[PDB]
């Protein structure tokens, strides 16, 4: 696979099986996801009632960012009071699901896609702010730079979802710039990530893919706007990949795909580093075989009599 999936496959399959089934069964399984997020599935009250919980270390910051309302108008009346040890909880009963199959399938997909659904609140807020500044600047072109600066100052938003990762996003009259504070431990991971990040920068440059958002990466130094932001170390070992999303990159027909893509970026990079390790393994063995071919000299020709198959010559003559 080349592109990482955008939701939890186990939740999707479980929901599909339990919706299409006729005899439900009690289940209690806790499932982990990428980036430390953990999901818990249980049926404590009724065999036909399923409760799903979300765990995330940065969730209170999401609440500060205004994610409760987004979750509410995303998931309707399904909202349920959170369970112990978890952040967001949902309770679903199979007796009230829509009869039509496509509604059930889309509900299962939406529930399985809870990760980005809860993580996309800052992106939606940034898009709304970008629209506001766009219309305000269209009201008077001469009033752009000062409102742009005040938006870079006040609306500068940030989040820490991993302890070596950070998203810094802020809107403007025409763009929503985002900064990733990438850093890889596990030395060999950082070793391969250096090459991966270098090649990832070049990509955009090539005229072949100029339609993509502009990338900006420079290790050992952060951009001008985030040196004063708390949490950003003074370039200890952290890279900083910056994507500039213009108006065309979040057109009303392409917002969700862009959000999911920009969210999954880092996990894609990690998984593909591992895939590159496997690629080495296979090539390296594949032509150490050629070295063995080179060695197979220095063996005088000899003759084996039959050695027919799964046995020893199967005959005395």
């Amino acid at each position: 696979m080349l592109s990482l999936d955008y939701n939890n496959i186990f939740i999707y399959e479980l929901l599909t099986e339990r919706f299409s089934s006729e005899n439900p069964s009690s289940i209690d399984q806790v499932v982990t996801d990428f980036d430390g997020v953990t999901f818990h599935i249980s049926t404590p009250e009724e065999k036909t009632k399923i409760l799903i919980s979300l765990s995330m270390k940065c969730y209170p910051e999401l609440v500060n960012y205004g994610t409760l309302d987004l979750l509410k108008q995303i998931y309707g009346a399904y909202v349920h009071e959170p369970e112990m040890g978890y952040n967001f909880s949902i309770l679903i009963d199979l007796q009230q699901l829509p009869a039509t199959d496509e509604e059930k399938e889309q509900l299962a997909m939406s529930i399985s896609m809870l990760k980005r659904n809860v993580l996309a609140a800052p992106f939606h807020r940034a898009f709304t702010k970008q629209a506001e500044l766009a219309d305000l600047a269209r009201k008077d072109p001469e009033n752009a730079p000062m409102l742009d600066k005040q938006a870079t100052s006040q609306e500068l938003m940030a989040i820490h979802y991993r302890d070596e990762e950070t998203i810094v996003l802020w809107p403007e009259h025409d763009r929503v710039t985002v900064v990733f504070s990438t850093k890889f431990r596990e030395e060999t991971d950082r070793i391969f990530g250096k090459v991966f990040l270098q090649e990832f920068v070049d990509a955009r440059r090539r005229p072949a893919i100029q339609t993509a958002p502009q990338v900006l990466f420079s290790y050992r130094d952060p951009p001008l706007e985030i040196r004063d932001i708390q949490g950003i170390q003074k370039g200890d070992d952290f890279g900083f990949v910056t994507f500039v999303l213009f108006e065309r990159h979040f057109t009303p027909q392409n917002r969700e795909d862009c959000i999911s893509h920009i969210q999954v970026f880092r996990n894609t990079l990690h998984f593909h580093i591992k895939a590159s390790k496997a690629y080495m393994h296979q090539r390296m063995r594949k032509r150490v075989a050629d070295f063995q071919k080179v060695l197979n000299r220095a063996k005088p020709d000899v003759e084996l009599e039959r050695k027919t198959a799964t046995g020893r010559s199967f005959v005395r003559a």
Partner: peptide
């Protein structure tokens, strides 16, 4: 040769990821 192949595959995956915006 293998470090060249590493660079090539990194370029390919970067392009594949980035082109699908």
């Amino acid at each position: 040769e293998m470090k060249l192949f590493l660079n090539g595959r990194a370029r390919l995956v970067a392009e594949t990821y980035l082109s699908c915006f």
